[PDB]
């Protein structure tokens, strides 16, 4: 009973860490697209 709780708790931490890792990709890809469009408009 204790072993499966420790296993589930270890997987719970991994699920939340993968979500944090994913959030940074979502935010930095938006920054690079928005800055690139800003340069597209600035050159024109």
């Amino acid at each position: 009973a204790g072993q499966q709780l420790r296993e589930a708790k270890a997987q719970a931490a991994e699920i939340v860490e993968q979500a944090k890792k994913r959030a940074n990709q979502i935010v930095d890809e938006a920054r690079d697209q928005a800055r690139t469009e800003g340069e597209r408009l600035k050159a024109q």
Binding site: E37, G38, L41, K42
Partner: protein
């Protein structure tokens, strides 16, 4: 991307304005340096004496 486009646009008008203002002052100096003679002092020294 929008405010900065207006930032450059107005700065260019000011760069032109700085040269046009110098030319307009130079023009006024050249005009007065030919349009003024003895007929102007009787309309300027006389004016100052009331001020």
């Amino acid at each position: 991307a929008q405010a900065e486009i207006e930032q450059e646009l107005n700065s260019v008008k000011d760069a032109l304005r700085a040269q046009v203002g110098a030319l307009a002052v130079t023009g006024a100096e050249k005009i007065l340096g030919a349009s003024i003679d003895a007929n102007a002092h009787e309309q300027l020294v006389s004016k100052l004496a009331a001020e």
